[PDB]
Design an enzyme around this catalytic site. Structure first.
Site, PDB file in Angstrom:
ATOM      1  N   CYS B  92       0.819  -1.206   0.000  1.00 10.24           N
ATOM      2  CA  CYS B  92       0.000   0.000   0.000  1.00 10.24           C
ATOM      3  C   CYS B  92       0.854   1.259   0.000  1.00 10.24           C
ATOM      4  O   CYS B  92       0.443   2.281  -0.555  1.00 10.24           O
ATOM      5  CB  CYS B  92      -0.945  -0.020   1.190  1.00 10.24           C
ATOM      6  SG  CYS B  92      -0.100   0.246   2.771  1.00 10.24           S
ATOM      7  N   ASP B 181      -7.821   4.004  -2.390  1.00 12.47           N
ATOM      8  CA  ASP B 181      -7.410   2.871  -1.566  1.00 12.47           C
ATOM      9  C   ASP B 181      -7.460   1.637  -2.454  1.00 12.47           C
ATOM     10  O   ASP B 181      -8.544   1.226  -2.891  1.00 12.47           O
ATOM     11  CB  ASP B 181      -8.329   2.730  -0.354  1.00 12.47           C
ATOM     12  CG  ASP B 181      -8.019   1.509   0.496  1.00 12.47           C
ATOM     13  OD1 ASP B 181      -7.196   0.652   0.096  1.00 12.47           O
ATOM     14  OD2 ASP B 181      -8.628   1.397   1.579  1.00 12.47           O
TER      15      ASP B 181
END
Lengths: 76, 227, 76
Positions: B92, B181
């Site tokens: 991420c 995201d």
């Protein structure tokens, strides 16, 4: 045997080592050539941080391998 | 495929951007508080915020109802948003930076042989699922993420350790604020914004993450700021 | 003496310290109250990042001064 240690810049530190040298010995050789205290050095090979108390042969680091030197930023 | 988690630290992310070949006229800086007194201290303009936050049960509860409302209601996502999915564990940190640069690329200046430039060039017309697979296979970024994961004031954890913290990026595209995201099926539209108020609008979204999780302190926000 | 440490979330931690306390000692005091490991902590005073070896006295941190805590956490 020769090994290479690349820094963040991409500068190469070339060391002469034996496979029986410990990582702590390697950090000492880097301090002698570059002045970087061992306590700040992190040595990376195959994306793994090496432990001072083990040898290059422990990590199957053969001649003319390239390691990466990371300098641990100081806390505060 | 499992990567190492990146430290939420401007010196880590700024060096990572330099290795990817980005010219340093934008630099991440820390965000110390959310009240306007503290924010008016971040250099301007700001073109992206990266938020590290904890994946708690209360998060993934709000998370699952946010998704189902958008599946029914069908939000506002322009095709010019650059969005890529996360299919690598602990990737991420890199996906957040890519989301930040890719949605601002005209403001960005790249250097000779820049690996991020080449990746964005090749991925500009891929689907978000295709971009995820492209990241899986893109050696230069995987290698650079790995050495960057060893930087910081903390030591990198072991690759098997559970990670309960996650990075997301907040950016302005076509007059709206997008949360990007990679764990979600699409960008999240958070309302209206502009280049001149992105920082304060982004921090208001950060505020909501925290108020949903009032006992948690494990948050960090960095701002991508003109330098 | 009392000092205040503010987090990004807006929480204020009130700490009992002395001028002789090192930054490391302050970080230990925050761990005791909030359970945040000291190596993940970064303390800020007057926009300036503090260093582990120095004391509150070195930075002229007074009673009822405000510090800022940013968390150097790892995201995955």
């Amino acid at each position: 045997m020769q090994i290479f240690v690349k820094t963040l810049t991409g500068k190469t530190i070339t060391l002469e080592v034996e496979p029986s040298d410990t990582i702590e010995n390697v950090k000492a050789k880097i301090q002698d050539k570059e002045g970087i205290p061992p306590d700040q050095q992190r040595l990376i090979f195959a994306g793994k941080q090496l432990e001072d108390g083990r040898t290059l042969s422990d990590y199957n680091i053969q001649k003319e391998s390239t390691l990466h030197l990371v300098l641990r930023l100081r806390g505060g | 495929q499992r990567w190492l988690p990146l430290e939420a630290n401007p010196e880590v992310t700024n060096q990572f951007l330099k290795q990817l070949g980005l010219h340093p006229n934008w630099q991440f800086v820390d965000v110390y508080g959310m009240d306007p007194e503290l924010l008016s201290m971040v250099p301007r303009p700001v073109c992206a915020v990266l938020l590290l936050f904890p994946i708690t049960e209360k998060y993934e509860v709000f998370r699952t109802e946010e998704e189902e409302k958008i599946k029914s209601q069908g939000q506002d996502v322009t095709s010019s948003v650059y969005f890529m999915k996360q299919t690598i564990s602990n990737a991420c940190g890199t996906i957040g930076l890519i989301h930040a640069i890719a949605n601002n690329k005209d403001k960005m200046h790249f250097e000779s042989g820049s690996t991020l430039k080449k990746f964005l060039e090749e991925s500009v017309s891929m689907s978000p699922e295709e971009r995820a697979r492209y990241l899986e296979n893109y050696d230069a970024i995987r290698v650079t993420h790995e050495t960057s994961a060893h930087e910081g004031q903390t030591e990198a954890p072991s690759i098997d350790e559970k990670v309960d913290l996650h990075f997301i990026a907040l950016v302005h595209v076509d007059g709206h604020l997008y949360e990007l995201d990679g764990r979600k099926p699409f960008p999240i539209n958070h309302g209206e914004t502009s280049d001149e108020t992105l920082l304060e609008d982004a921090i208001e979204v950060c505020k909501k993450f925290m108020e949903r999780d009032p006992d948690e302190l494990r948050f960090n926000a960095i701002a991508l700021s003109a330098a």
